[PDB]
Amino acid sequence: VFGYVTEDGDTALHLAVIHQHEPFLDFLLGFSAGHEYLDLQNDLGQTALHLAAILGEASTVEKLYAAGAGVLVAERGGHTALHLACRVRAHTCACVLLQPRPSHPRDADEDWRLQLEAENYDGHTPLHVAVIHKDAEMVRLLRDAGADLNKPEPTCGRTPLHLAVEAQAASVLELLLKAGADPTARMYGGRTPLGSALLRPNPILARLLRAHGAPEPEDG
């Protein structure tokens, strides 16, 4: 098995995606399929999948995924390939990942849903990231994928709804609300999304929470 690596820890695979060379990629994968070679992480902890996700190449993510690339592997910041997709609005890439791996590679615990609650070193799951980045489209894919809409992040227990309020992303706040995110959740301090929205500028946010049965805040 080939074993070349750059000073940055990038193997021939990493470079195939870095250079966006589908033909050579196909060649490499011709053998790599099923091997541990696919999951090798360069010095940033990134695998070829991670690179493909960052580049937002849905076609390249499928090949790697079809070939058996690990979907839970995390790079330096604890980001899985799905986490990275949620940072660069790579909607189509997330879609490829959010379903059972393709059957067979390409010759002309196997629960993909474990990606949904994977947490990075910032204590963020993919949904948190999608909301932090006010990515309504990504929130929709995650929702439909079955992501936990009430999952609190660990610095102060903010739920997706708290993050949307901080993000002043009303449309995201609404998506979460219509999908049933519990507006009664409070962060470690005791503050709720509404209570948080009141101390925020954009009036829309408070209106929404109100309209969706969010109880009124308790003084301060």
Binding site: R76, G78, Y121, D122, G123, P154, T155, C156, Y188, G189
Partner: protein
């Protein structure tokens, strides 16, 4: 008596080697009668800080203690909580994740 409560921290993860500085916001405490108590299955340890490190009794800056296993190969979740030596009271626990050492450790130990 005031209740012990951790309102917020700047980070919830760190190296299993300890030494990571953490900024912790909490409800009113007494600087000479407070500690940061870390626990896990069969493991206990406290954060490192001095009284000067307690800000207006509503914040503490401390360094995390090293984890039980220095050669951790996968993230280990533990509990972090405020403790009052006074009456042995404890705040509600907060998650903290210890992580493997990057480079040198395990790197020179069949990895790199």
């Amino acid at each position: 008596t005031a209740e012990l409560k951790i309102c917020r921290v700047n980070r919830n993860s760190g190296s299993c080697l300890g030494g990571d500085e953490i900024f912790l916001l909490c409800d009113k405490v007494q600087k000479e009668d407070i500690e940061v108590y870390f626990t896990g299955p069969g493991w206990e340890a406290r954060g490192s800080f001095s009284q000067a490190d307690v800000h207006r009794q509503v914040a503490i800056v401390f360094r995390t203690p090293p984890y039980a296993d220095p050669s951790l190969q996968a993230p280990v979740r533990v509990s972090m909580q405020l403790r009052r030596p006074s009456d042995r009271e404890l705040s509600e626990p907060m998650e903290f994740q210890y992580l493997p050492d990057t480079d040198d450790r395990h790197r020179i130990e069949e990895k790199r």
